[PDB]
Write a protein that holds these residues in place. Structure first.
Motif, short mmCIF file in Angstrom:
data_model
loop_
_atom_site.label_atom_id
_atom_site.label_comp_id
_atom_site.label_asym_id
_atom_site.label_seq_id
_atom_site.Cartn_x
_atom_site.Cartn_y
_atom_site.Cartn_z
N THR A 82 0.85 -1.20 0.00
CA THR A 82 0.00 0.00 0.00
C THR A 82 0.88 1.25 0.00
OG1 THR A 82 -1.78 -1.16 1.19
CG2 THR A 82 -1.88 1.24 1.19
N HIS A 136 -4.88 4.21 7.37
CA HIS A 136 -5.16 3.03 6.55
C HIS A 136 -4.04 2.59 5.59
CE1 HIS A 136 -7.34 5.64 3.40
NE2 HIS A 136 -6.34 5.06 2.76
N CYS A 164 -3.33 -1.01 6.55
CA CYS A 164 -4.28 -2.08 6.25
C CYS A 164 -3.86 -2.94 5.06
CB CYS A 164 -5.68 -1.51 6.03
SG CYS A 164 -6.37 -0.85 7.55
N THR A 165 -4.40 -4.15 4.97
CA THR A 165 -4.15 -5.07 3.85
C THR A 165 -5.46 -5.66 3.37
OG1 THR A 165 -3.74 -6.98 5.33
CG2 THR A 165 -1.78 -5.74 4.56
N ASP A 214 -8.40 -7.20 6.01
CA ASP A 214 -8.73 -6.39 7.18
C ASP A 214 -9.21 -4.98 6.80
OD1 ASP A 214 -6.34 -4.65 6.94
OD2 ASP A 214 -5.21 -6.42 7.56
N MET A 215 -9.82 -4.84 5.63
CA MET A 215 -10.34 -3.54 5.19
C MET A 215 -11.75 -3.26 5.71
SD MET A 215 -8.72 -3.49 1.33
CE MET A 215 -6.95 -3.25 1.09
N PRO A 252 -11.00 -3.24 10.32
CA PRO A 252 -9.63 -3.16 10.84
C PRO A 252 -9.55 -2.71 12.30
CG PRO A 252 -10.08 -1.26 9.48
CD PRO A 252 -11.32 -2.11 9.43
N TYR A 267 -7.03 -0.88 14.23
CA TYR A 267 -5.83 -0.13 13.93
C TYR A 267 -4.81 -0.19 15.06
CZ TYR A 267 -7.97 1.69 9.66
OH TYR A 267 -8.55 1.80 8.42
N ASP A 287 -12.99 5.28 8.71
CA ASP A 287 -12.04 4.70 7.75
C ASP A 287 -12.07 3.17 7.75
OD1 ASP A 287 -10.88 4.81 10.31
OD2 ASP A 287 -8.91 5.39 9.58
N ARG A 288 -13.24 2.64 7.45
CA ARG A 288 -13.40 1.23 7.19
C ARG A 288 -14.35 1.08 6.01
NH1 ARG A 288 -14.11 -1.75 11.70
NH2 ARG A 288 -12.54 -0.24 12.46
N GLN A 289 -14.11 0.09 5.15
CA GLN A 289 -14.93 -0.09 3.95
C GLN A 289 -16.30 -0.70 4.27
OE1 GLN A 289 -11.67 -0.37 0.23
NE2 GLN A 289 -12.93 -2.17 0.72
#
Ligand SMILES: CCOC(=O)CC[C@H](C[C@@H]1CCNC1=O)NC(=O)[C@H](CC=C(C)C)CC(=O)[C@@H](NC(=O)[C@H](CO)NC(=O)OC(C)(C)C)C(C)C
Ligand SMILES: CCOC(=O)CC[C@H](C[C@@H]1CCNC1=O)NC(=O)[C@H](CC=C(C)C)CC(=O)[C@@H](NC(=O)[C@H](CO)NC(=O)OC(C)(C)C)C(C)C
Lengths: 301, 301
Positions: free
Chosen positions: B25, B41, B44-45, B48-49, B52, B54, B187-189
């Motif tokens: 990333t 983020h 992140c990978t 874990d999107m 996550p 953090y 900040d999480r999908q």
């Protein structure tokens, strides 16, 4: 899915902006290596504005007739000449911030960024197009002359415009960095007016390709058109005639989207004839003509 | 008479942009003195999107987990922490290009310039407003995270925004430089969506004052209105209610033009109810809400 008129980052050009004063006239100049470029009308005064003889006016000046400031630091003029509508001032220092650069004369329809400056100090940046009538719909207040337009590609700055005047309609006129005017304009305060302008057909089409690459297809249709039949609708709606060269330029965008150019032209003809009825393309309620096919690629990376 | 959305000159911010990599990333970071700020983020990978932790993800990293590049030059991470949704990377060198600066949390309606960047390299600049719904109608492609928004006043850079995500509608969400999100976003999908937006009444009014200061008066009328009667038309056309604070802010522009605020509000109410019928205000066919009263002053210097 969001789409803005993007300007090039202005840093490389900010570092070249200086103030040039001659009498009670101050304006901006461009400092590259050991040369400062600026509108020759720095040398004019109150009366000799409607009818200046620049050759006569310049012979009466010396190297210390010109005061040049980079920041608050002063630069010494050690020689000077006039090239077309520009002054070329030789100074004692090479600008330590001179980017890699070139001078280009752009063609109508092409776009560029302008760094609006006042008294050698950068104040704003915006993206512009050279109109078919050789003016720009810019934003320039008193003290903006000598502001430049430019493109940047991998750290090479292509300078293309320097600002000289505002025309009666509020639009702006200026020169390349040679500086020959774009359009039939002269640097004297006379009765000159912009000619009638036209919409830039090639850019509208490019921007419709951007809308599709960006996901939106609502304006598309099942029809096609011939070049000549298109140019009849174009002529009525004050659009530039489409040429085979424009059709070829739209090649890559046509291939990427799988929509034939003349099919896109059919779509545009339908937009012109029927309006947009309450709907928007890439956020807009109007057909945008200030993004080139090159602009579309770059912003749809 | 020409009027553009002007961005601040981007030089002072370009000099602070860097690339931050962690695993596979890469994104942008902001390098001020000996700190590099970036979206957390980066750590992140793939999997874990959507969920996550953090704190858990960060404890597993060391100073050499982070690769930071200014130009092609490498910078050594010598310490790190997480502040809200941002990472704060301490590095061995102080940025020699650090401008005078501050961090500000802007309010909805306020405008700022964004320097869109890819892999630590500045690519474009444009002017934006914080929408009432806490998003921005920006232009951001893959690799734009960590791009910043800012205002500049006499060489002081006020940073106000860092980019984190695009929402489903195509609009953008991010944080201040603390970095607490603007709006209810995380900040999480996940399934987050922008709330319904509103037109920024105060800015439309400011921009109508600009049109008059710029010479054009066609939309004005002989009527006046009360605040409450205005807010009823506002509510129907999805405009923010006007408040007495907004009326006071419009004081200087009202005095300069000699048009009373509630008289301008009458003019706007008439524009809303009757449309614009083929005509334009400062070049536009729509009512523009992304210029503040402060923007109007500065560009009508
Ligand atoms: C501070 C002093 O130095 C400068 O920086 C000058 C910058 C401004 C540019 C202006 C400012 C507002 N918008 C602009 O672009 N340029 C000029 O004023 C130009 C200087 C030209 C000389 C000295 C021969 C002249 C103009 O732009 C002037 N424009 C015209 O005269 C135009 C085109 O000839 N004609 C025109 O408006 O028609 C009339 C004469 C019938 C009213 C306006 C200021 C009225
Ligand atoms: C190169 C790798 O590093 C980066 O720079 C990331 C920059 C982009 C910003 C994007 C790119 C396109 N427009 C943008 O603004 N940001 C992201 O992708 C964000 C990273 C967030 C993490 C890792 C928790 C996530 C998003 O923006 C993603 N957006 C969402 O998930 C949004 C909001 O949660 N939700 C959403 O679209 O709804 C679904 C999930 C139901 C489809 C999109 C890419 C689909």
């Amino acid at each position: 899915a969001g789409f803005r008129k993007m300007a090039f980052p202005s840093g490389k050009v900010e570092g070249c902006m200086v103030q040039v004063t001659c009498g009670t006239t101050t304006l901006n100049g461009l400092w590259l290596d050991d040369t400062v470029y600026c509108p020759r009308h720095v040398i004019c005064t109150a009366e000799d504005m409607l009818n200046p003889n620049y050759e006569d006016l310049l012979i009466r000046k010396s190297n210390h007739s010109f005061l040049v400031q980079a920041g608050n630091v002063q630069l010494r003029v050690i020689g000077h000449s006039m090239q077309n509508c520009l002054l070329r001032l030789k100074v004692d220092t090479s600008n330590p911030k001179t980017p890699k650069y070139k001078f280009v004369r752009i063609q109508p329809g092409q776009t560029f960024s302008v760094l609006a400056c006042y008294n050698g100090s950068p104040s704003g940046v915006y993206q512009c197009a050279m109109r078919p009538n050789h003016t720009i719909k810019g934003s320039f207040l008193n003290g903006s002359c000598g502001s430049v337009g430019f493109n940047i590609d991998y750290d090479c700055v292509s300078f293309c415009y320097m600002h000289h005047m505002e025309l009666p309609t509020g639009v702006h006129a200026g020169t390349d960095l040679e500086g020959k005017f774009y359009g039939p304009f002269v640097d004297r305060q006379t009765a000159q007016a912009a000619g009638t302008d036209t919409t830039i057909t090639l850019n509208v089409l490019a921007w419709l390709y951007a809308a599709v690459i960006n996901g939106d297809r609502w304006f598309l249709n099942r029809f096609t058109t011939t070049l000549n039949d298109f140019n009849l609708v174009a002529m009525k709606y004050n659009y530039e005639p489409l040429t085979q060269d424009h059709v070829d330029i739209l090649g890559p965008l046509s291939a990427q989207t799988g929509i034939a150019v003349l099919d896109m032209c059919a779509a545009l003809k339908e937009l012109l004839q029927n309006g947009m009825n309450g709907r928007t393309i890439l956020g807009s309620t109007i057909l945008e003509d200030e993004f080139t096919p090159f602009d579309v690629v770059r912003q749809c990376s």
